[PDB]
Each structure stands twice: as structure tokens, then as C-alpha cells.
């Protein structure tokens, strides 16, 4: 499955962006990660088309209420990514 | 149930904003999350009307004593949001 | 019991502010929370009068040695606050 | 094995940089570490040639979408590094 | 016992300041706490005279190599402080 | 044993500085600590001569690729330091 991601500065932009992604396409919200500085990121998985609709829906909403840091789709993420980041079809992670 | 959220820069604005939300409407404070940078966020659930009264009460108070980062109501949050964020009618989360 | 709170930027202001609060009135220091950015907050509980004496004693001291972010008393905090914040007469929290 | 590393300010640059590294050379993504301030770092291991191809692929991508903080290859990292940093051929670490 | 405290921006100032405090007087290093933003604080306990010698030794050293945020002695800290902060003659705390 | 320390703003400077320290002298990397703000610090132990060679090797490298915050050797660190900081000849710490 492809991967879509949205970064926001502020958590309410990011929760709203996520609700938008998920309502706008068959994508699944799989995890969310903050890195300090107030930066936070949501990840979704689904079909490549969906992740483009998703992240495009989610970017819209973020910008209406927050501050988008970045939006991006990786169509075919390396399986190696699922080991290290909270982007994985089964609660595999991002809790340490 | 709808979802209301308030972000503040500083925790005493946010505790006061929360006491305000909860006193002003039938909404329930369900969790609170910081993301570094001194940003912190409270979430409430209740009827759509309540979450508008709540967050409108809470914004007032925040601004009197702190620095509101953002206020917002999502009337019908996707169930997918409850998996990933501390917005959930049963201590399901935001402890890892 | 009422609730008093002091925010400081820097932890030595905040420890001194707390020693001040607690020496100046019958209030009890119940917890302390940092939110990154170097922001940290102390909470006390006691009679409404005490929490005004407390926080007024604590603000004085903070400002002599640090940087007060904010001071504030909520006379009758909603019981809902004790679920989510380290403001509670019994080590109920703020450890996750 | 050599060690390659990419730092980004923002996590979506860094996830994209990583997918790039790993697709562009026989290197293995071994861990990722944030240090607050929104700084985050990915580490890869492989042959010296690979880690140069990797990190050069990963830098490209980071800069297209984010803000690279730094890129660098250490051809022959001291074994002492594997004790203290998440750069190690076997989930040995960076969880405390 | 009295309480002395030093705040530094940067951890090597703070480790050096601590070695200084402890070599210069009969005070005991009891804990150290960071609050993000790169702020970190060391606490010592001993006789009031010692904590003045200590913190005065420690301030000197900090300023030679770092950035002192603040220095301060509280001669007779409320017992309530030992519940909430890492200032306590017996590893009672500051691990949650 | 003496103690050497390097602070960097950015983790790849710091990993490179460490590989340098350890290759340049008989010193041992004993731990590493971040304090938010993107500040991170490595500690080494060895003979006083070594820790001067080490930290001097490590500073060089840091500055070529990052931003050194500070370098410093304490020849004879108080045993009290090993209780509170990740500077200790036996995985005693800095995990809470």
C-alpha cells in the first residue's frame, strides 16, 4: 500500500487534517509521531489514488486552521520503513 | 459524539480553558496532549452544540490568561481518530 | 479545594516559587508538569484564600529569580480536571 | 559495515530520504533518532560504496521536500558506537 | 538540609558546575532535571554555608564554559518539595 | 579515570565526533544524553592525556560537519557525578 503523510505545527491542525484524509478516501490512519518543537505527523496507507486524495484533502484542512509543515505520498515505501517508523498496517510500532 | 479541542502555549491557560469548557456545556474532557515547544492541547466530547459552547467558553478563558494556539470543533470525527489520538470516550489511550 | 498554579520558564524559579507558596499559606503542592520549551508548572490545592496567598507569594519569588509565565487561581475546579492533570489531592497522576 | 546518516528538520523529509537511501543501494535502515527541536536522524549500514549512494540518494530527496540538517558516511565506525547509538546490525537499541 | 541549585543551558556546563559544587563544599548532589529547550538543573543538599560555597563554586565554573541560567540557595526547603522535585536525601525520585 | 565531553547541536556531528574521540585515544565511550532543543552530548573516560586527545580529535570532526556546543575535560570527576550523569565505567545509567 502507498503511504501519505502530513506534518503540521500544532496538534489540532493535524487531528483535523487526519479526519479529512480518512473521510475523503479509502485510506487508513496508521500512526502519528511528534518530534518536539511542536512538529507532528500523521501517516495513512491505502491505494496510490487514495493517498493522493487523502493527503490533498488533509492539506486543505490543515491550512485552514493551522500551519502545514509538509504533505507527501510515497507510492511504494520500502518494507524497511515499517521496521523503523509508525507506518505499518498492524500496530507494530512507535511505542518504546 | 462531536470533538472540541483547544491548543494553548502554556499549561495554565490550558487548564483554565478546560475548566471553562467543562463548566459551560455538557462536554467531557477526555485527554490532553503536549507536543514540545510548550504546545498543549485539550480534547472534549459531547453533543455538537455543547462542543461549540465548550470551546467557545474555553477560548475566551485561554485568551484572558495565556496564548491560544487554536480552537476547533469537528462535529463527527472518524472512528479512526480514536485509535491514534487521546480523543475517546474510554481511557483508551495516549500513554505509550 | 481551590487550585493555584504558577508557570515559570526555568526550573529553579519554579522550585523557589513553590517553596514560597507552601510556606505562605495552608496549601498543598500536588504536582508539577513540564511541557518542553523549558516551560514548567506547579499546582497547589487549599482554601480559596490560601491559594490566593500562596500564588501571590510564589509569583513574587519567581519574578525575583526567573521568568514567570503565568499565575492563576481557579476557586472550584471541575472534578474532570483531576482525571487529566496533576492537580489532585491523592497521587493519582501525571505519570504515564 | 559502513554507516550513513541523514538528519532532517521535519519527519516527512526524513521518511522520504530513508525510502530513497534504501531503494538506491544495498544498505539497511537500522534506526532513527529524534533529539527535540524537531531534529531527526536516520542511520543505514552497508558497503562503503552503498552508503555513499544511499546517502547521496537520500539527501537529494530530503532537499526536495524538507530541510536537510546534514549527510555523512563514516566508512568504519568504531564498535563502541553500537553500544551508545541506534546504529547496529541487530535491534540492539535505542529504546530506554 | 539546605538546597542549592544551578541551571545551565547545555549539559557540559552543568556537569562541570556540579563537579565544582561537590568539590568545594560538603554538599551532596542529589539529582538533575531537564525541562526541554536545552535547560538542565542540578540540585545539591548540605549545610547552608556549604550550599553557598557549592553554588558559588558551581556558578563560576558554569560561566567559564557554558551559559548559566540561574543560581540559588533555599536555606530550609519545605518538606513538600521532596515529594514533587528531585531534591531529596534518598533516591526518592524524579523517575516516572 | 578522567572524563571528556562534547556537545553538539545535531546528532550526526555528535556521532562523528564520538567515532573520532574513540579512534584517536584510549578512551571509552560511556554514554550520550540529549536535553531537547536538539542539544546532545557524548561522554568518554580514560587517562587524562587520552581524554585531551580524544576530545580534541572529536571537536575537530564535529566542527567540520555540525555545530559544536562545547568541549571539556574534567581530569578527576567527583564520584558523585556517576550517580546522577551517564558518565560511568559500567552501564549504571541514564535510563529512567
UniProtKB/Swiss-Prot annotation, chains A, B, C, D, E, F:
Record key words, sorted: Bacterial microcompartment
GO MF annotation terms: identical protein binding; structural molecule activity
A Pfam family reported for this protein in Swiss-Prot or TrEMBL: BMC
Main location: other
Superkingdom, taxonomy of origin: Bacteria
Boundaries of every BMC domain copy: 2-86
Cell compartment(s), UniProt: Bacterial microcompartment
InterPro entries per record: Bact_microcomp_CS (IPR020808), BMC_dom (IPR000249), BMC_shell (IPR050575), CcmK-like_sf (IPR037233), CcmK/CsoS1_BMC (IPR044872)
GO annotation terms (biological process): ethanolamine catabolic process; protein hexamerization
Pathway field: Amine and polyamine degradation; ethanolamine degradation
UniProt-listed SMART domains: BMC (SM00877)
GO annotations of cellular component type: ethanolamine degradation polyhedral organelle
Subunit organization: Homohexamer with a central pore of up to 8.6 Angstroms diameter. The hexamers pack into a two-dimensional array. Interacts with EutQ.
NCBIfam families: PRK15474.1 (NF012018)
Protein family per UniProt: Belongs to the bacterial microcompartments protein family.
Reported function: Probably a major component of the bacterial microcompartment (BMC) shell dedicated to ethanolamine degradation. Each homohexamer has a central pore with an opening of up to 8.6 Angstroms. A positively-charged funnel leads to the pore from each side of the hexamer; a phosphate or sulfate ion is found in the pore. The pore probably allows metabolite passage into and out of the BMC.
Protein name: Bacterial microcompartment shell protein EutM
Amino acid at each position: 500500500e502507498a503511504l501519505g503523510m502530513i506534518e503540521t505545527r500544532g496538534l489540532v491542525a493535524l487531528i483535523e487534517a487526519s479526519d479529512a484524509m480518512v473521510k475523503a478516501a479509502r485510506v487508513k490512519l496508521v500512526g502519528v509521531k511528534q518530534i518536539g518543537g511542536g512538529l507532528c505527523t500523521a501517516m495513512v496507507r491505502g491505494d496510490v489514488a487514495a493517498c493522493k486524495a487523502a493527503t490533498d484533502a488533509g492539506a486543505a484542512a490543515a491550512q485552514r486552521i493551522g500551519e502545514l509543515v509538509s504533505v507527501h505520498v510515497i507510492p511504494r515505501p520500502h518494507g524497511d520503513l515499517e521496521e523503523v517508523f509508525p507506518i505499518g498496517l498492524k500496530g507494530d510500532s512507535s511505542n518504546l
